[PDB]
Design a protein around this nucleic acid. Structure first.
Ligand SMILES: C[S@@+](CC[C@H](N)C(=O)[O-])C[C@H]1O[C@@H](n2cnc3c(N)ncnc32)[C@H](O)[C@@H]1O
Lengths: 105, 99, 167, 96, 86, 98, 79, 108, 96
DNA sequence: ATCACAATCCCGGTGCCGAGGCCGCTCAATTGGTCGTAGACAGCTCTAGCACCGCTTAAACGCACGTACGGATTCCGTACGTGCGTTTAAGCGGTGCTAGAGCTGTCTACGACCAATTGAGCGGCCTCGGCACCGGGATTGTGAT
DNA sequence: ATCACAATCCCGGTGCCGAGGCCGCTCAATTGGTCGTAGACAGCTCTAGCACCGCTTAAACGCACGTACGGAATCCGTACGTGCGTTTAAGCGGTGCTAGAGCTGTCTACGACCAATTGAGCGGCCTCGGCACCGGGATTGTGAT
């Protein structure tokens, strides 16, 4: 358990997040638990998007995540869509929806 | 035998479905290159663009216009219409805060 | 000293520029240029004074015509080889229009040669719904250069008759 | 030859994906998008934590600053679960 | 003969391309006056982003507008773009 | 007797309230609403008077801008009355509503 | 029950400042809901700021910080 | 020693160059802050303040008043297109709104 | 005693007296002007910090202060603010 | 066009409080000199952006047609606005309190910094399965019979 | 309603190339220790946020009434979608050229930093005039003639 990420039970790099916080000009000091906490949050959000992306890939009977699957995952979940509401994902397309007034009667 | 012709609108629905299912860029690449270079020539002469730079501009532009057209369609439906008119785009951009 | 910085809004600068440009449109004040003979090109325009980018160069004046007369006159000029092709199409709002400059007059926007690597471009200028096509410098031009622009004919058959792409 | 070092979250996003979907892969474009997402969220949370530190005249980012930043940024259940799992991570880190 | 006509690059965003962009937004029916109008708006959008982009290129003392510069210009306008970083 | 035609008093009122800067929502009901809302998030919360005043400033500015967008939406629909669908459209275009 | 403290004439005055000539009868409840949503969104952030400061009082600075986090910066309260 | 001439007077500015430099250093924006950076930033701040105050004073004199109130600042910002773009997502307390009614609403 | 708060009140007042000698400013309006100066300072300085971080520079010079000014302020404001800033930096350099 | 008529605008007095100016201090901006390192500048590499040429053909363009729809008109009923009188609760002003915000003083745990160690993560390479393209059969939405 | 019939979905065949896994290196994360100091906390002060009470109108509310307008139905013209045939220029790919993006080295001048100083700014205080409210004639959209 030499690496801090292994100590914290995380896959994201606690040490690299610590270095980025130290070099990012946020404050002159960064606590010991701040990189651990931020890495945990980052890997949680990564897992949350990747699970829905894998679900979209399965719905498309594909075994690889592509930008389309990430876009579908982000825009399908309301909270993820709110978190990523002001971003555009390259080669992601848009959600398939035709307005009910547009559908023929 | 009278030749077959689809009723107006159903081909539009099919185009909507296919272009919402796909992710390929809808604006031609080289005309977008030319427009970007011509519009960037008012800011700095003798510029160069990375291929990925114009790629990013095209993706951004496309996404912007698709969101604008979705808002325009909503503004058209609000006016009890199905056609999108220029006033719909003006209203969408006024509400979005661009104008 | 009541120091009040003067900052023209981005609603008067283009207004103070539209009327600063159209005052060479309705007028024929075509100064700063001369007529010369260029090898293989015949009559051409030479800049006698320094031009910066965005500076008005010369208006392309002629008879403003519709397409229905445009095609007939184009056929007429095709029939007569010595008449020449001085005519020039364009688009405006939702309709196409054209300018005819075949009639030899003192207007000097018609006497400009062609080049894909030129120094000027043609732009539209609307005056009460009336289009006017104006050649404007694309970059800083010193005095003595020949004025050139792109004829906008990258067609297969047009190149057959007049194959002056570059150089 | 021997181009310079470039830092990215590719391997860690891959490990997280293998933990969640062990038989699902990810393309280079989707991996780049995941990297951009991780960088964007890291920058956003770190900026909010810096704002929290400057607002309260504190010169350090602690786990509490990052927790408050996450509560500010992520909406709804996302904030709750991110806070819970970050607290679990800091507890496990301090235990060992 | 000849087909002497001015060409401007804003018309490179053709009417069918605009139609496709509107279809992806879910538009059945499009007025003919949309195209020019939306052409203009595209230009406006470009006039913003590229300007910001070129400003970035001016600060780095570069003559090439890189993808990262466009990403920065978009992120400035609250239009963050994913997949082009790095 | 005398009775103004409908709408004219509305225009007079529009001019009146667009000339003035005074807060339009009564302060005590707004403060009670703020306290009730904040009770959900943290109990036994005290509010600075300036804090409630800032909340009222922001709330009234937001509602006024929203009603301006709503009026534009109503006029777009060839109407003069603003309707809840107009508010919904304005919020959806602004991106607040899903 | 305090949401009804934002009375009908208050909504009418807010619409008048927005330039609204005629107001539908269902506008009032929709506007009350919109104001409630906006207030909850701002107040949550403000109370988060107070919690981080370990304060039991929601100050003006916390409110303006909450507004600024949402891109609605407020001038005149110490920002 | 020599006479202390500050740094705003060196650049001909009213805004405090030294205070802007101190805020830049204490704002933790970068590891180092150039000498001319606070001067440039103070000059820009002074120019923007001068523009806002000029338009606000014009608005106040238009309303037959000699003191700038928040309403005059709001009128100055919202009447100037560029300042309105700069302060688009900015709410001015006790500023109200521009007086404008849509043409359709007016009686015919 | 103590209770000392930093503000731009006197500087905004001095520039007002330069631009409008015969007018004053109220406490609320002065507070709004102070908030405006703080907001613009923070915005330009944040953009300058981002500019320095993008180009791997650890110093905020006048060049990226100018670049931040050009990025934030719209066209004519950007041009005139750049003019004023360059004039001030030239005067400051000519008085070392 | 013509009429009175409530609502608005204007001019003048008054108080009165918030803005504008002055005094002392103190804390920060200034002056001066050192150090070291971030950055400017010069030089080299080689990457990739630009530019061209040919051909294929997918797509854009141009045209004729008809039909779905945008838009103007009309009318009906209701649901708004406007004004009245009654209720109520906002607001002002005053009093009491006390919880908590803000400051001070100790100091202890905590984080930056440094030397050294090494292994996690980078790039480069290979390789083979997911996937794109394609062809064919079956199934399906659509619109006229 | 039934059936062409154009469109789409589903079954593999097969080649492509890019995702993934392995190996070498290397440099950045880790470990251990030192030291300065940031903020955790204990206590004091005293500010203002809360709670209550009592009139006092300003404001909200409930009702009546009628008028404008929202919305539905109808008819008409037009303009846009659909398909077809022509053209055109997008795109691919292949080849060169050289501009400059990126990296490396040096040397330097520029900014952090420290110490001592003093003066500008801020808190505090006074005083005084401009703005808000009252009160009376000038005015001006406004609704009925
Ligand atoms: C606009 S008219 C120019 C007027 C006319 N050629 C003269 O010189 O008086 C275009 C005609 O000039 C000729 N032309 C245009 N550009 C040329 C060039 N670069 N070299 C030779 N001939 C040119 C073409 O043959 C075309 O028919």
């Amino acid at each position: 358990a030499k690496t801090r990420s292994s100590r914290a039970g995380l896959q994201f790099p606690v040490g690299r997040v610590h270095r980025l916080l130290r070099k990012g000009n946020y404050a002159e000091r960064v606590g010991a638990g701040a990189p651990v906490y931020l890495a945990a949050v980052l890997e949680y959000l990564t897992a949350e998007i990747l699970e829905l992306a894998g679900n979209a890939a399965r719905d498309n009977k594909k075994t690889r995540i592509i930008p389309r699957h990430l876009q579908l995952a982000v825009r399908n979940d309301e909270e993820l869509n709110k978190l990523l509401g002001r971003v555009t994902i390259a080669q992601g397309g848009v959600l398939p929806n035709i307005q009910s007034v547009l559908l023929p009667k | 035998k009278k030749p077959h012709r689809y009723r107006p609108g159903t081909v539009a629905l099919r185009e909507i479905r296919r272009y919402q299912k796909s992710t390929e860029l809808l604006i031609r690449k080289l005309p977008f290159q030319r427009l970007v270079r011509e519009i960037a020539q008012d800011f700095k002469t003798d510029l160069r663009f990375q291929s990925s730079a114009v790629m990013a501009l095209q993706e951004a532009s496309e996404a912007y216009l698709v969101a604008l057209f979705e808002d325009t369609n909503l503004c058209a439906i609000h006016a009890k219409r199905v056609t999108i008119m220029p006033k719909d785009i003006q209203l969408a951009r006024r509400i979005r805060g661009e104008r | 000293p009541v120091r009040r910085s003067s900052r023209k809004s981005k609603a008067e600068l283009q207004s103070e520029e539209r009327k600063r440009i159209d005052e060479l449109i309705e007028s024929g004040k075509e100064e700063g240029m001369k007529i010369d003979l260029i090898d293989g090109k015949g009559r051409g325009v030479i800049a006698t004074k320094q031009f910066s980018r965005g500076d008005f160069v010369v208006e392309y004046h002629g008879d403003l015509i519709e397409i229905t007369d445009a095609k007939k006159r184009e056929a007429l000029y095709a029939q007569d080889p010595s008449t020449g092709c001085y005519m020039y199409y364009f688009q405006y709002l939702s309709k196409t229009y054209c300018v005819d400059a075949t009639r030899e007059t003192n207007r000097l926007g018609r006497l400009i040669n062609h080049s894909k690597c030129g120094n000027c471009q043609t732009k539209l200028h609307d005056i009460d719904g009336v289009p006017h096509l104006i050649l404007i410098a694309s970059r800083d031009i010193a005095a003595g250069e020949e004025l050139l622009y792109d004829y906008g004919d990258r067609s297969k058959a047009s190149i057959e008759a007049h194959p002056w792409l570059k150089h | 030859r021997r181009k310079t070092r470039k830092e990215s979250y590719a391997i860690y996003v891959y490990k997280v994906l293998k933990q969640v979907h062990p038989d699902t892969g990810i393309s280079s474009k989707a991996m780049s998008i995941m990297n951009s997402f991780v960088n964007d969220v890291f920058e956003r949370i770190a900026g909010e934590a810096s704002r929290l530190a400057h607002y309260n005249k504190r010169s350090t980012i602690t786990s509490r600053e990052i927790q408050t930043a996450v509560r500010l940024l992520l909406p709804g259940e996302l904030a709750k679960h991110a806070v819970s799992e970050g607290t679990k991570a800091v507890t496990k880190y301090t235990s060992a | 003969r000849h087909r002497c006509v001015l060409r401007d690059n804003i018309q490179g965003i053709t009417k069918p391309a605009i139609r496709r962009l509107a279809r992806r937004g879910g538009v059945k029916r499009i007025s003919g006056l949309i195209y020019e109008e939306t052409r203009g708006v595209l230009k406006v959008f470009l006039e913003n982003v590229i300007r910001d982009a070129v400003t970035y290129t001016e600060h780095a003392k570069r003559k090439t507008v890189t993808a990262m510069d466009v990403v920065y210009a978009l992120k400035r306008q609250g239009r963050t773009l994913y997949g082009f970083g790095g």
